[PDB]
RNA sequence: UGGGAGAGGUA
């Protein structure tokens, strides 16, 4: 109801919210896919 | 007084020994041996079943005056076994609990 | 992935921006929740603009005051009732003029409930200009309707039809909708017609969220529907039993027995059962050999179970790592990956030093088989996940595969030393020599007696310098010096081993040498604690 | 000793000589069902209770009633076993003569109009079984007993629930049998409130003057009355001196002429003795005083009119003036103290802001009922409902009896609606509770809760039904014709039949019996359980209600629940504990008379065990004598202390009565730790019947009674010498004196062989009885499935060392030796029941043959040509059992495609097959093939052989029958014939059956004659008939489910071997699962060369405290010593009198034991039976709390030629070396639980999935996937597996498009990941969308 | 085949 009412977003950053989406979490061996992710979204 | 009894008659019992003289050592009684070593138990269990079993409580908190003076050796009476069923139905209840 | 949409004809009120506290229409009209649901409820009337100043904005008139009113002016004022005027009031507000008003109100003077509540409205209204959103939208006119394959008809074994009350709610919004319609083309009288939009919003709050508004509306068994506000929210919810935890394919369970003959990374699979698991593995194996044709063949082959379906298992399992799982997996040592050994049987063979870190006995306990598919998963299976890297508890730094009662009687049971039992004062050649003066009968594991010992120390570098001397120990002790590797001094076995002795041996072992000799110092201390137990004979008695 | 006890006699430890008999353990059911069932016209008990509260019923003008006669209970169609078998509840049908009798409304009183009644059926209540089971819709069910809390009133305290203040707020509560609860309590601001049916508070005083009541009689009632009189401007106080007790004087409180207090003084107890023997009474008091009490009662002036000061007014000077010049000259004042009169009611009716009756009617209904306009007829006829109606609101014994006992009434009984006076002094001992004088109730007292057994429940639920029938029966009676309208058009019997199936069927209490072993059975109808219907829940349950209370001693066992979540709720009634009428738990009792243990035995309640003073059943006696010592040991007010011999009033019957029944059958269980033994007392209920089974050697005496009493056994009737035993039947003739003369006295015990239970394990009966042997009443004819010659015998004793061996028992787990699977000691039968339904589908029926299309002789070898496997033919997984085929095109014709059918043919239409296969792991030989089939379906080859065998076996029964009934009748026409005359040869000189042409002069014997030829030719036409009705009801076809043709159930009798991960357990808690099966080489083996059977784990003594499993190890080695002493006397066959010189000096060891068995009484083929019967073994009665000691097992080892240490010296059998210290060797009593490797192994590749979120299925049944839960999911989040979590989450689950392509990536050896996003994601977007809130994933 | 309740049990 706060998000709705907000018009919040999700940045997808979480362990848990990547266990939902279904993607690689930000834990161990994901971190190298989410931060050449990150430098993606950067650098364009 | 009892559990210090109890665990200096376990602890020091062998005694019958030979070629010095008559000397004295720690027991190897597989009780005391698997108390000591960590294995499964400790000297509160060792107390419940060679010494007193102690003092227990009522559920309202309250500790009872007369304590349970026999251990799981010499075998309870009815109204202790009636009185120990109060604290394993309570520790059973509140290990659920947490 | 397709919906409908029902056409409401009386635009009703969304539950969740009304009941759920803070109400959000309450909070933004700042009229009282009793009074709204009194307007919503047909009960009470309310005026949304009047020309005169006898009726202002938000005053809720009864019916005896509309009927005064109705008489008395009839044509400058315009009152509704329900929750059409709801959404005429919201739309006829103004969010930047009542925000830039309530920013002047918050200047004069501070009562802390009043700014409280001032600067509660503030950030709703300031959430509204700058998330976009229109406050009429909380008004539902245009009702969604679920796809028919997430709002299921299933069927039973006799005939008959068990839906989902999703279907039910569906249908009671649909036929009071329709109602509704027929009503207001039949030129109702008022009460029959406000009767039936009370019911229609009634239906569309049960639908949105059953126990919410009133009385939750129950089935035909006597029990409350499921809405969709209770298919998502609460124990059995979307996001808590399919989203976070799913059910998992080629998975497998099996009571778990002890097995002491493995090493510390290994496990016994069943062969039934693991065929079961790694079916088409065997598929692919079968089709790269030759031995199958086609897809069909190749499932019958599996089916037929043939010793070339055996043999073919037997290479596809080796070194292939499967995840020993068990509920409740409090701390993370409860999964680990173990290299799998056929064996004949139906339970799952562990090892018996990781059940100090599964907290599981052999009182009946079930553990679950998860196989990973893919090179990626294997890889972390091998690296992260192997029962010989993770031997120190992530909780505090110490070692958790420990002997556990059994190696420790054992091993408690050699490195204690009687007084004169049997062979007492000799001197000997070394470890070895005293391992054959027991195996022979001629000294007890209790005779204090005077060995060679050859122990490293470590250097300044990796290289390990050599003292050789004669030591005053035991026969026992004499013995676990050919378990105990290079590079640990001889106090850490000269007193007698308790359980925090051994993990003391343990986690000096680790920091001096590393991980594998901890590893094979830890499966062959486990070894000789289990043949001196057995050799022992410590029996309880009544005496 | 019977003739079956003296077979083998199990030598008894006791020392307690026992005075009272166990009873029959299955009463509680039996009496209250009973009493249900069975016409009690005065005591109304049940089915005539319930007509009699609702008939008879007038319509709403008072024209036509219906009047209640009588009732009688049908006979039931099928029995039993015939219930069982065909799948049909087993009832009895309702019949009830109902009149219905119309009055005349043109007459005054037209009683005399129509007389019309019959027998309106309506109703089909099940019945009770033998032994205390009912069989609804084929299964077998136990409706367990409910533990709830009495009707009454319940006085209690919140204990500082306010944490700011700290008080205790008192409350009462009127609980109601059945009707609206009423609840009174105080708030912090101590004022008495009302809440009605748990809804809002309102003011006390409002429901009485709801009563009718204004505050001159509410004063009255509560609060009593000192006088104030003006007399020359002075003021007069009556005073009686027992009022200033505890208080202070505010002015000086003096007399005529004598000082007695002063200022600032306390007036203490001398001064109140003072007081009473100076005997003043008028005492002067100045003005200041009257400011601070309140007025009585009201005063109206005479001259003016109007109210001066009304009732419950605060007085001070003002008001005191202007009464003094009114004229008033008599004032009376409420007392007020803070001791022990507090000014409640006072300040609840300042609160009160009611006027009077019909304003506090409207409050009340504006509290019930909220939103409804309220009026003064409805708010009259809602007060009068709720709490004054006979009919809305009853208690009616219990919650009188309750009410009259905590409000210290006198009579027991009275009206079952609440009264004004009765609410007057519930407020009045709340108020007192308040004070000080009285106590309050604890909840968990037995006293408060009371068992609401079968019959009951099943009452209330046909009441429940009885409710809506005269609701619709004044429906039809208020508007529709009188005259022409029978009763049973009218009555539908359709509410009740629904509502009590509805109970007997799928109630919270009528469940599933567990009937794995007869000690299961035995403990599901021993069942207490707290929950149900009205009861607690598992959320609503704190440590209060779960824990022991101390007035569970004797009624409720403390060790013998569930270790759940059910650890308090499901309890376990104890063995001697009875019911009492009312309802509550009462246990025996020996009543003592001046130190002499009387053998009269008394039952006390909970209530009355609380008053005497109750011994220990461990005091010593005198031989009916005295005690002993001089502080004996005993328990009063609920707590245990020490008093002397003279004042004890009651000793505990018996040493036993403290447990159950699961908890008195484990031996040694005082020395286990409670925990323990609550643990083996619930494996002792999951004990899988083994194949041959074995007695425990140390016992407790109880066997016997669980064995004899479990309805499970066939007992003896009528004893006799039995005639011909055969392993289905046993025929019997009974003794001469036990025989009636009308009988033929030859009773037949049919034994079921082989039928399956609830639990898929067999049920079977071999007789133990031999042919020719006497027989008295009472014993053991047929050992059940677990039981031994009378005994209970639930698992195998087998010999047991206790060293750790090689890690293979590591944790709780068991080595066992490979002799127990070579002498199959562990293998049980599983007989499991398949079904094959044949539906009728809209394109034809489903025919049941061999031509089965696309299949062929691998899967057909063992069909017959009607398409049913033979019976003996051993299946396996995949086999087809039945042969049936759903058509695929059509079968109805018209007559354009008859013609055409005698032009052309047919066609195939029999594509899809639906075949009944075996379910993949189960084997097994099939045993029994029923093919049930519809009334109007042509049978096959294979039915009509099915219904030749049961017609010829049936034919032999009844022919049986017959021929027992014709020499039955032989004897009495021989009796009245050596009766009439003196004929002995020439009867028996001529064959048996030409008994009747016999004759002489015609004369009244003669008479007898030709009477008892017509009962001979009606006994055979009474045969013939029963015959024809035999032949019909077999022959004809079961009404089974619509769409339904036949049904064919196939029995498969798996054999269940043990295996590496069985699991095992002893009695003492101690169990585990087999890790390996060693062989018989490998075992260790002693100086005798016997090897060990199992080898044990020593650790799980200490750390666990069962020592009981060590004292039966030792009793075992004992035991079977002697054993092996009988049996090696037997083996070199020495002396019948040397046998029973050692086996009287075997029996007669104990110190001061119960029993005294003496073989001179024996025969020669009694003590060599004798000696037979314990050469496998002696057994040993060891009971609970009284057993055997250290000192009696030592004396039993050093008779038996053992070493008295208990331990042997073992050597090592897979090395040849010797164990360097003494192993613990012994037999131990080890049972086989029901978790068996076969049912908990399971596995899946890829099998069908879910519809909604498309994720795999759950379950070993349906082919399921293990759950990777939340907790997992932290695991893999902890290690950092991240490519494991995608891969677990995406492509072994809820992902189509990637599971198919992993799917086809590893059968084409490419281990590759193609993910993507979950469906289970899609269907929460798809459900927020549809709550209406826009949620979507924004791309970039 | 798949869904939902109720009861029982194992860790
Ligand atoms: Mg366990």
């Known amino acids: 109801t706060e998000a709705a009412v907000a018009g ?33 979204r950067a650098a364009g | 007084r009892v559990s210090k009894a109890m665990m200096d008659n376990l602890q020091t019992e062998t005694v019958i020994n030979r070629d010095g003289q008559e000397e004295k050592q720690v027991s190897f009684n597989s009780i005391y041996m698997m108390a000591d070593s960590g294995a499964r138990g400790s000297a509160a269990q060792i107390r419940q079943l060679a010494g007193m079993r102690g003092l227990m409580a009522k559920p309202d908190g309250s500790i009872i005056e007369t304590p349970i003076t026999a251990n799981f050796r010499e075998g309870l009476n009815v109204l202790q076994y009636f009185i120990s069923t109060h604290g394993a139905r309570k520790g059973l209840a509140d290990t659920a609990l947490k | 992935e397709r919906m409908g949409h029902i056409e409401l004809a009386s635009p009703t009120a969304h539950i969740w921006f009304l009941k759920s506290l803070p109400s959000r229409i309450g909070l933004l009209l700042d009229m009282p929740l009793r009074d709204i649901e009194r307007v919503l409820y047909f009960e009470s009337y309310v005026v949304i603009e009047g020309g005169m100043t006898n009726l202002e904005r938000q005053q809720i008139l009864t019916e005896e005051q509309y009927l005064d009113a109705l008489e008395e002016f009839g044509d400058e004022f315009d009152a509704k009732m329900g929750a059409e005027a709801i959404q005429a009031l919201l739309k006829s507000m103004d969010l930047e003029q009542e925000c830039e008003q309530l920013r002047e109100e918050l200047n004069e003077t501070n009562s802390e409930t009043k700014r409280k509540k001032l600067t509660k409205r503030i950030k709703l209204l300031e959430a509204f200009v700058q998330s976009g959103n229109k406050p009429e939208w909380m008004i539902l006119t245009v009702l969604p309707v679920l796809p028919p394959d997430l709002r299921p008809l299933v069927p039973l074994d006799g005939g008959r039809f068990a839906t989902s009350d999703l ?47 009133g009385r939750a509306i129950t089935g035909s068994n006597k029990r409350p529907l499921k809405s969709l506000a209770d298919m998502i929210k609460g124990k059995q919810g979307r996001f808590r039993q399919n989203l976070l935890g799913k059910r998992v394919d080629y998975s497998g369970r099996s009571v778990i027995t002890v097995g002491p003959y493995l090493r510390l990374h290994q496990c016994g699979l069943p062969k039934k059962m693991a065929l079961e698991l790694f079916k088409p593995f065997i598929y692919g194996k079968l089709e790269l050999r030759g031995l199958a044709t086609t897809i069909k063949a190749a499932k019958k082959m599996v089916e037929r179970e043939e010793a070339v379906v055996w ?41 018996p030093l990781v059940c100090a870190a599964y907290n599981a006995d052999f009182d009946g306990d079930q553990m679950a088989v998860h196989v990973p598919l893919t090179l990626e998963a294997q890889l972390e299976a091998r690296a992260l996940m192997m029962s010989t890297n993770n031997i120190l508890s992530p909780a505090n730094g110490e070692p958790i595969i420990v002997p556990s009662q059994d190696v420790v009687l ?47 120390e470590k250097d300044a570098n990796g290289e390990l310098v050599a003292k050789t001397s004669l030591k005053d120990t035991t026969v026992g002790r004499a013995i676990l010096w050919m378990i105990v590797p290079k590079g640990l001094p001889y106090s850490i076995v000269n007193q007698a081993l308790g359980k925090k002795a051994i993990s003391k041996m343990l986690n000096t072992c680790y920091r001096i040498l590393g991980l594998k000799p901890t590893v094979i110092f830890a499966d062959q201390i486990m070894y000789t604690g289990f043949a001196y137990a057995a050799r022992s004979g410590a029996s309880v008695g009544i005496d | 000793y019977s003739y079956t006890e003296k077979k083998r006699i199990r030598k008894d430890f006791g020392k307690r000589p026992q005075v009272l008999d166990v009873p029959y353990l299955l009463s509680i059911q039996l009496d209250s069902f009973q009493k249900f069932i069975e016409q009690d016209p005065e005591g109304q008990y049940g089915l005539e209770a319930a007509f009699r509260s609702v008939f008879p019923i007038q319509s709403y003008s008072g024209n036509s009633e219906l009047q209640y006669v009588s009732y009688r209970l049908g006979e039931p169609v099928f029995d039993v076993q015939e219930c069982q078998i065909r799948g049909v509840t087993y009832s009895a049908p309702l019949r009830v003569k109902l009149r219905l009798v119309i009055y005349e409304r043109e007459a005054p009183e037209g009683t005399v109009k129509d007389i019309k009644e019959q027998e309106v059926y309506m109703g089909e209540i099940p019945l009770m079984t033998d032994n205390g089971t009912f069989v609804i819709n084929g299964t077998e069910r136990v409706i367990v007993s409910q533990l709830h809390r009495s009707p009454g009133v319940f006085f209690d305290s919140d204990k500082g629930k306010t944490h700011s203040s700290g008080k205790v707020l008192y409350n009462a509560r009127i609980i109601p049998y059945r009707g609206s609860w009423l609840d009174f309590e105080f708030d912090p601001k101590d004022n008495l409130f009302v809440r009605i049916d748990r809804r809002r508070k309102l003011p006390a005083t409002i429901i009485l003057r709801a009563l009718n009541y204004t505050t001159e009689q509410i004063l009255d009632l509560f609060f009593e009355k000192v006088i104030f009189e003006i007399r020359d401007n002075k003021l007069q106080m009556e005073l009686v001196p027992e009022r200033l007790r505890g208080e202070t004087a505010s002015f000086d409180i003096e007399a005529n002429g004598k000082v007695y207090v002063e200022k600032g003084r306390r007036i203490t107890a001398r001064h109140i003795r003072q007081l009473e023997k100076d005997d003043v009474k008028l005492i002067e008091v100045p003005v200041e005083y009257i400011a601070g009490k309140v007025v009585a009662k009201d005063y109206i002036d005479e001259s003016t009119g109007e109210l001066i000061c009304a009732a419950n007014m605060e007085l001070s000077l003002d008001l005191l003036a202007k009464l003094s010049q009114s004229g008033h000259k008599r004032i009376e004042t409420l007392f007020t103290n803070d001791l022990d009169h507090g000014p409640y009611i006072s300040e609840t009716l300042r609160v009160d802001p009611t006027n009077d009756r019909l304003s506090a009617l409207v409050e009340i209904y504006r509290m019930m009922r909220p939103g409804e306009p309220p009026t003064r007829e409805a708010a009259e006829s809602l007060f009068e409902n709720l709490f004054f109606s006979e009919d809305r609101y009853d208690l009616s014994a219990v919650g009188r009896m309750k009410f009259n006992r905590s409000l210290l009434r006198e009579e027991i009984e009275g009206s079952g609606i609440l009264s004004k006076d009765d609410i007057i002094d519930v407020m009045k001992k709340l108020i007192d509770i308040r004070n000080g004088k009285g106590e309050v109730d604890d909840i968990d007292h037995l006293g408060n809760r009371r068992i609401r057994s079968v019959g009951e429940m099943a009452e209330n639920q046909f009441r429940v039904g009885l409710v809506r029938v005269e609701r619709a029966v004044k429906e039809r009676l208020s508007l529709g014709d009188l005259d022409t309208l029978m009763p049973q058009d009218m009555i539908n019997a359709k509410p009740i039949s629904a509502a009590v199936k509805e109970f007997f069927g799928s109630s919270q209490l009528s469940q599933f019996m567990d009937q794995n072993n007869p000690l299961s059975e035995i403990t599901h109808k021993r069942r207490i359980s707290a929950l149900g219907p009205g009861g607690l829940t598992r959320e609503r349950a704190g440590f209060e209600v779960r824990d022991v209370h101390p007035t569970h001693y004797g009624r409720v066992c403390p060790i013998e629940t569930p270790e759940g979540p059910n650890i308090g709720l499901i309890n376990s009634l104890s063995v001697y504990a009875q019911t009492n009428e009312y309802g509550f738990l009462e246990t025996p009792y020996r009543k003592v008379t001046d130190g002499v243990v009387t053998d009269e035995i008394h039952y006390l309640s909970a209530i009355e065990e609380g008053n005497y003073v109750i011994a220990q059943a461990n005091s010593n006696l005198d031989e009916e004598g005295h005690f002993v010592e001089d502080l004996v040991t005993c328990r009063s007010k609920g707590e245990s202390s020490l008093f002397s011999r003279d ?23 005082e020395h286990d730790d409670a925990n323990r033994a609550l643990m083996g007392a619930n494996m002792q209920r999951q004990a899988v019947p083994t194949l041959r089974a074995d007695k425990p050697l140390v016992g407790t005496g109880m066997e016997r009674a669980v064995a004899v009493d479990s309805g499970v056994t066939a007992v003896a009737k009528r004893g006799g010498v039995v005639q011909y035993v055969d392993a289905s039947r046993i025929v019997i003739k009974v003794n001469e004196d036990e025989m009636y003369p009308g009988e033929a006295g030859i009773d037949i015990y049919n034994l079921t062989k082989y039928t399956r239970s609830n639990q898929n394990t067999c049920i079977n009966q071999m007789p133990c009885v031999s042919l020719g042997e006497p027989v008295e009443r009472g014993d053991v004819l047929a050992d059940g499935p677990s039981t031994d010659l009378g005994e209970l015998a639930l698992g195998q004793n087998m010999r047991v060392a206790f060293m750790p061996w090689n890690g293979y028992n590591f944790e709780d787990s068991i080595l066992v030796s490979e002799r127990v699977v070579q002498e199959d000691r562990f293998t049980t039968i599983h007989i499991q029941e398949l079904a094959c339904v044949s539906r009728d589908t809209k394109l034809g029926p489903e025919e049941i043959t061999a031509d089965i299309p696309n299949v062929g002789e691998a899967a057909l070898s063992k069909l017959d040509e009607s398409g049913i496997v033979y019976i003996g033919a051993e299946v396996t997984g995949g086999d087809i059992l039945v042969g049936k085929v759903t058509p695929k095109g059509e079968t109805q014709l018209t007559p354009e495609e008859k013609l055409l059918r005698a032009i052309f043919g047919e066609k195939a239409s029999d594509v899809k097959d639906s075949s009944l296969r075996v379910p993949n792991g189960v084997s097994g030989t099939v045993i029994d093939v029923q093919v049930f089939t519809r009334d109007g379906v042509e049978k096959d080859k294979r039915a009509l052989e099915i219904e030749e065998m049961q017609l010829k076996q049936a034919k032999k029964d009844l022919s049986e029958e017959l021929q027992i009934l014709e020499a039955g009748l032989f004897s009495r026409i021989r009796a009245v014939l050596v009766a009439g005359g003196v004929e002995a040869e020439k009867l028996d000189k001529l064959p048996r059956d030409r008994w009747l042409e016999l004759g002489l002069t015609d004369e009244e014997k003669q008479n007898q004659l030709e009477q008892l030829a017509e009962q001979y030719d009606e006994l055979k036409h009474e045969f013939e008939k029963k015959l024809e009705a035999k032949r019909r009801k077999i022959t004809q076809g079961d009404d089974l489910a619509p769409g339904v043709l036949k049904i064919v159930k196939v029995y498969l009798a798996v054999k269940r071997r043990i295996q590496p991960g069985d699991k095992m357990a002893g009695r003492h808690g101690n169990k585990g699962v087999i890790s390996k099966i060693n062989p018989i080489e490998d075992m260790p083996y002693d100086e005798n060369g016997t090897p060990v059977d199992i080898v044990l784990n020593p650790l799980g003594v200490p750390s666990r405290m069962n020592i009981g499993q060590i004292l039966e190890t030792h009793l075992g080695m004992a035991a079977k010593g002697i054993g092996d002493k009988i049996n090696a006397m037997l083996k070199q066959q020495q002396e019948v009198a040397k046998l029973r010189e050692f086996i009287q000096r075997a029996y007669d060891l104990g110190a001061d034991v119960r029993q005294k068995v003496d073989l001179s009484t024996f025969s020669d083929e009694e003590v060599m039976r004798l000696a037979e019967n314990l050469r496998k073994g002696m057994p040993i009665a060891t009971p609970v709390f009284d057993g055997a000691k250290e000192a009696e097992i030592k004396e039993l080892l050093k008779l038996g030629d053992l070493p008295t240490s208990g331990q042997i010296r073992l050597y090592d059998g897979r090395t040849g070396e010797q164990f360097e210290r003494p192993v613990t060797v012994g037999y131990m009593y080890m049972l086989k639980l029901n978790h068996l490797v076969d049912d908990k192994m399971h596995a899946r590749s890829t099998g069908s999935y879910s519809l909604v979120t498309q994720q795999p299925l759950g379950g070993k049944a349906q082919f399921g996937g293990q759950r990777f839960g939340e907790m997992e999911v932290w695991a893999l989040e902890a290690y950092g597996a991240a490519y494991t979590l995608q891969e677990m989450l995406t492509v072994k689950s809820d992902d189509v498009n990637g599971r198919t392509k992993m799917y086809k990536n590893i059968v084409d050896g490419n281990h590759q990941m193609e993910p993507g996003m979950p469906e289970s994601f899609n269907v929460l977007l798809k459900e927020i969308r549809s709550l209406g809130i826009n949620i979507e994933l924004e791309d970039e």
């Open chain 1, 8 to 40: 919040k977003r999700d940045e997808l950053r979480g362990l848990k919210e990547n266990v939902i989406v279904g993607r690689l979490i930000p834990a161990g061996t994901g971190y190298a896919y989410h931060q050449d992710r990150m430098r993606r």
């Open chain 3, 167 to 213: 279907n039910d709610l569906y249908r009671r919004v649909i036929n009071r909708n329709n109602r509704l319609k027929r009503l207001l083309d039949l030129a109702a009288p008022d009460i029959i017609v406000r009767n039936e939009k009370r019911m229609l919003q009634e239906a569309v709050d049960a639908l949105l969220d059953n126990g919410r508004r």
């Open chain 3, 311 to 351: 043999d073919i298992l037997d290479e596809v399992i080796r070194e292939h790592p499967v995840l020993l799982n068990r509920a409740p997996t409090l701390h993370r040592l409860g999964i680990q990956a173990f290299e799998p050994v056929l064996i004949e049987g139906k339970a799952i063979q562990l090892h």
């Open chain 3, 410 to 456: 054992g091993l408690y049971y050699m490195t204690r030393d009687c007084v004169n039992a049997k062979g007492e004062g000799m001197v000997l050649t070394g470890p070895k020599e005293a391992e054959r003066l027991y195996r022979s009968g001629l000294a007890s594991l209790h005779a204090r007696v005077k060995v060679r010992i050859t122990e490293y």
């Open chain 4, 647 to 669: 004042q004890v009033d009651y000793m505990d019957v018996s040493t036993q009565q403290v447990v159950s029944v699961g908890a008195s059958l484990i031996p040694f269980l």
